[PDB]
Amino acid sequence: DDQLKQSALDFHEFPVPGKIQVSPTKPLATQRDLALAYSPGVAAPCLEIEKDPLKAYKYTARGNLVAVISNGTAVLGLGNIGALAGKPVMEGKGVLFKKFAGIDVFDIEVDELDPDKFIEVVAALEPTFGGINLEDIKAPECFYIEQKLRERMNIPVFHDDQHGTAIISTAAILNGLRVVEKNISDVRMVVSGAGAAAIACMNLLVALGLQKHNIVVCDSKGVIYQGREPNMAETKAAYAVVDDGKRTLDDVIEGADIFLGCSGPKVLTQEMVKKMARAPMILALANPEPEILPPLAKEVRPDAIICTGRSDYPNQVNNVLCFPFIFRGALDVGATAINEEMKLAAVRAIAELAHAEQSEAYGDQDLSFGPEYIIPKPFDPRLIVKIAPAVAKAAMESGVATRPIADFDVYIDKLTEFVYKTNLFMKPIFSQARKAPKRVVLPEGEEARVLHATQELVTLGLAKPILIGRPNVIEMRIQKLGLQIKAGVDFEIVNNESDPRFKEYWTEYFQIMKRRGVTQEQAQRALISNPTVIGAIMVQRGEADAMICGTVGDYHEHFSVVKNVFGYRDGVHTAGAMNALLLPSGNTFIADTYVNDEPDAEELAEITLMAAETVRRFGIEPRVALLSHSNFGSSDCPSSSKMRQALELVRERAPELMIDGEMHGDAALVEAIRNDRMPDSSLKGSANILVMPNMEAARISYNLLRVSSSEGVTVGPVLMGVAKPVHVLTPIASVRRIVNMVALAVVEAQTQP
Amino acid sequence: DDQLKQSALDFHEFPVPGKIQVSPTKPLATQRDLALAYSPGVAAPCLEIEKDPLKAYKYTARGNLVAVISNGTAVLGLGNIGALAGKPVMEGKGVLFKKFAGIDVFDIEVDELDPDKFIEVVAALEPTFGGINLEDIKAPECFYIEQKLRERMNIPVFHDDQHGTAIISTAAILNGLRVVEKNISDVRMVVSGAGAAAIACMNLLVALGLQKHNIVVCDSKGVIYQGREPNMAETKAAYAVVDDGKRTLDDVIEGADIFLGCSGPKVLTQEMVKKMARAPMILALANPEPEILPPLAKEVRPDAIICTGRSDYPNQVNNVLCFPFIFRGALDVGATAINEEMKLAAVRAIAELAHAEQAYGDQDLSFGPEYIIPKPFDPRLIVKIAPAVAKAAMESGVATRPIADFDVYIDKLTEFVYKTNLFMKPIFSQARKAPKRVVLPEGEEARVLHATQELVTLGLAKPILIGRPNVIEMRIQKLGLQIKAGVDFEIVNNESDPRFKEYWTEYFQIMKRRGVTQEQAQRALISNPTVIGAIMVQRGEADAMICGTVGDYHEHFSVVKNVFGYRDGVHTAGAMNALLLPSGNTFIADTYVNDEPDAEELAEITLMAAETVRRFGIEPRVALLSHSNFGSSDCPSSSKMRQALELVRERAPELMIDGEMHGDAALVEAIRNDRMPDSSLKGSANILVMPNMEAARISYNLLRVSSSEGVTVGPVLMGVAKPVHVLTPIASVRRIVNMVALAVVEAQTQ
Ligand SMILES: [Mg+2]
């Protein structure tokens, strides 16, 4: 793409150059605080590391630090573009390391092409880092460098491209073998191209039972023929195929149970897939193009199982699926290196994650074990809970574990807390929108941000945009922005001034509002000036299915329009406004940020129920907490008494819901603070839904936190309780916020109308 | 020591090992956000660097990233201890880089001892960082390493221990020569100890006007004269003098205007100080012990100007004075290295900071014999030095990124200092200068006990604890605290005290018509500790009180308001909490006093909060928060805010404030400029007045968990006559110590 290619160039620059930053972890406010971080206090920690260098984890960041190193020789698929140009990728490793594994990571770019000299620099940096992740080092240098460094360095050395992708591919093979019911020793494996991971796949596969003679390796020149070259690379000589008269891939593909290979753009054809054995396993792992298109192989062989590196095709083999979770277990036991036994233990846990049953969505996915699901989702949360204990338990058995863990259950619980914090509810919602697009009206069609959103909604294919406004101003603005969206084709424009059904529309609005103080002469004025009214009428008739408005205008202008045309949903008598923020405590929400200035007891209860119902659908656990200036009966304020009555009310309508209150804000986010004021609290962990006692409390909180918590744009002001799928936005809402909200409306529009 | 050397070991251990962490700067909440960061969107910023390596600073962390590298051969005063053992010093280095100048730093510990492999490893790491910092490398290996690395690498390389110390020292001599009225060409300088900083300082001084024939150097063997040894070090040979028949320091110290010592302690004697020239400048920079102690030199010569490395003596020479700020100027213009023209303008920037003129800073910044080097924590350091570095680098021709306007540049620099101003440091220093008697009613509470130890050790206050003496002493032992009763602190037994009869009678006369009986007053003087300390402060037995660590806020506040009363001129009270937010130090009020303050009460709160922030040293930027944004909603809460704004402007026009506004408009200037271009408020406001307590309390709660890295000032009580503050049950020991320090400062001026 070019639309998404440019939004990343902007992302890597705004607001600050660079993605990662070194921040303090200990205070430094006072003058004594400086005398303990430096002179003369810092003398003591250094003198305890010369006494005992094993005590380095206690006083330094070495106990959770890994260096991603690269010379830029083969960055992803770009090639040798330079070590300096490869820095944004190495920073990406660290930011993914921190987001998922919580492992502080330094990006290191070494300007050395000589394999020996490069090895010296890395061995020199051993005391600095607790672990070394070798990244984007072209072949065959990587085989030599990684081998020498693991022996040389008493800290773990790992190659994510060579060994990491092998752990995923090996796990897929073992799982796929269980589905086709073929024993590993019997299957014959054929590998295309001199894949760096291919050598490690076989090694791991051999350690599990795969016969070497069954393995047939095919370099890009041809099949490996023993003796065709007197001088041969050690990786090619180790897996040597005796010359059997087979020169091409089409010669060895017949009678082959498994196909694999990093190298090769589109080496597999539809005719070669027919020639393969029963229920073939196809592992296509070339970044630009799969070895065979997965539908092309399914058409000739329905029993086949295909694995690609690309995310659109199922069974994604992502490097991000393992390499952070391996280092996490290794760093927690202080392993001297990552032995093959640990890597294998990771392969087991990854396959075990597919077998284990799913738990607890608006997005529609099935995780049942089958030909579509032989490897877990690329961003599955349970990865850390399973991979890290297995790596550490194997490391303690192997004897490289310097530091033991007394109880694995305590360690798992720490890992369990980290899982709760991170969730990606947005991605399944988007995919659900592609399955059944619905028409959505945007009343502010002439606004610049709406136009940018209209394109990205048309590009991803989420909904049918129906803009409102003077077409003349829209057409001009499109050409000034550089967009390729076509009126009457990509999106339907409705002019507020010229409309055939105009008389039909004002008669419906008048029949609704004749008694709410709207004359006929006013209603006709209304369907030309306020586009919110126009779209609102369209949804009730069926001309559209949802509406996203409020990108320019006071919230209550648009909300009063909605409230009158569609009315409350069934079984509701008050509406709610829920905003979201990405907090250290995880994804968190605020209740009634715009609707009711002073919500009463029963009104506050209905808001809570709708927010819980709406969060359940997102794929997030509803852990609700009512907030007040009172702490569990500190004050008898009428606003604090109202919160208490609401807790009792919700308990009778949805007793299964987890909620407690009232409490201070800190008590709802830190489980420790809550355990000292209330041990019996039904609330467990960080709460994600915060119901406010009044709007001022809400709007002051959402604002002050949006700036100082994080810039995670997820869902803006989510309106709840209205019978028709509608959401009203803030005027300062960014373009990314507009897109996300339109998708949310489509999934709500797929629901029973 | 054994307590300042044990508490240092606990400082690094908990709550998390280490002193730094890698933190994301970019959003990572949605799957698209992740895609833009790594595969595949990461390929776009990389392909732009394949076209031009200059686009790096624009798309990567370089230009704000510097590496502090060491081998472990000269770690402070410890010496060669290993590269691993020197890691905590390298973390503390870069953490000063960030806290003082905002320059992220990877510490790098190289496992090397041959200077050949060392230069290779570092030069290999050139593409990563925008600059290289060398620290704790033994001599003479450091000279050779730095020289080779500086020419080889086109990014700056700087030895902190030698060049940084030389820049400060050179500035000191220039200012001292103005004091003693001596031209630089005419003065004669003698140097003992061939330390790396001395050689560079002389080289720097020679470029500024100092004469080599006037300079005489003495190494351990003797006075460096030409032809003493056929094979001589190239650094030593540059300042060897014509043979004057003098081999001893005593022979050459005669008639000497400047003495600079990098050698061992006690090389200079009182007899040598007597025979120096008029008003000698003695730069006794030695650690851990100075060559000559300043008082012994002051006795023989009172007019002399002396500087050492230690902090307790005046005119302390500290590396933290320049080394963060030289790099900040070089990186903002992307200098290829650090040259002599910059190093001179740096000396010029530091010396010119002592002449210009200037309130919690008790230390008087008057240019004289005791002040020729600015203070270590001085705010204007980065504002002055970095522009001179960038300007002198642009004129020497090594900068790759021209700054068009130095005015906008200085503004960005000034905003960083005001945002990160450490108000706590000057407070603690003031508390050390004069301890005052402070009462802590919850004496049995462990956190209070822990806080008392830190107070005594630092010498902030003389504590008076109330409680059962049995339990306090028993808990002290269980905690392991070394404080002893009757000596470090006083205890007043609640159950039995000789002044009991006087206290309940004094309390009763204050509260007889407020619902307290004689019999009720007596029960209260044994059961409620907070009542006791209040009577003491009013009687004069104690100068201030810090309570509320246990109990609901309004119990302690009720007692306080009755006894102490409101200050003259104020009829309402307020509660302020402090947060170290990303936008800056931010205060919120009121959070515990008034549930629904009226307009006039809201205005007085604002005025008092302005006074308190001004006392801290931070400039007051005030914003009135409401759900309505500049009248978007007309309601009692919003109308109240607008009225208060007019009231505050009448009582004090100088105060910068605008309202009402949304929260985002107070923090993000961009949002406020769009909604109101004419807003008198500028930048990011630091004082947030609230419409009602319920919103303030729910804000501070959800914020103190969203900006966890700062623990500074707890609930500040504003308006009460006597120096009193009430805390929270969740108040950390950090918080109780800090608040007692605030209490002491307040009680000094009653
Ligand atoms: Mg790589």
Numbering used by the authors:
A (entry chain D): 2 to 361, 366 to 758
B (entry chain C): 2 to 359, 366 to 757
What wording appears in the published article?
While reducing NAD(P)+ to NAD(P)H, MEs catalyze the oxidative decarboxylation of the TCA cycle intermediate L-malate to produce the TCA carbon source pyruvate and a byproduct carbon dioxide (CO2) in the presence of divalent metal ions such as a magnesium (Mg2+) ion. The hybrid-type MEs consist of an N-terminal catalytic domain (ME domain) and a C-terminal activity regulating domain. The PTA domain does not possess an enzymatic activity of PTA but acts as an allosteric modulator of catalysis; that is, binding of some metabolites to the PTA domain increases or decreases the enzymatic activity. Binding of acetyl-CoA to the PTA domain is known to reduce the catalytic activity of several hybrid-type MEs.
For structural analysis of EcMaeB, we initially determined the X-ray crystal structure of EcMaeB without cofactors (NADP+ and Mg2+) and the effector ligand acetyl-CoA (EcMaeBapo) at 3.85 Å resolution. There are two almost identical homohexamer of EcMaeB in the asymmetric unit although EcMaeB was previously expected to form a homooctamer based on the results of size exclusion chromatography and native electrophoresis. The EcMaeBapo homohexamer placed the PTA domain and the ME domain on the inside and the outside of the hexameric structure, respectively, as the BbMaeB homohexamer does. The hexamer shows the D3 symmetry, where the 3-fold axis is located at the center of a triangle formed by the PTA domains and 2-fold axes at around the interfaces of four protomers. Here, we define the state represented by this homohexamer as a vertical (V) state because the ME domain dimers are almost vertical to the plane on which 2-fold axes exist. The result that EcMaeBapo is the V state instead of the H state could be due to the effect of molecular packing in a crystal, which can limit possible protein structures. The RMSD calculated using 1900 Cα atoms is 0.51 Å, showing that the PTA domains of EcMaeBholo and EcMaeBapo are almost identical to each other.
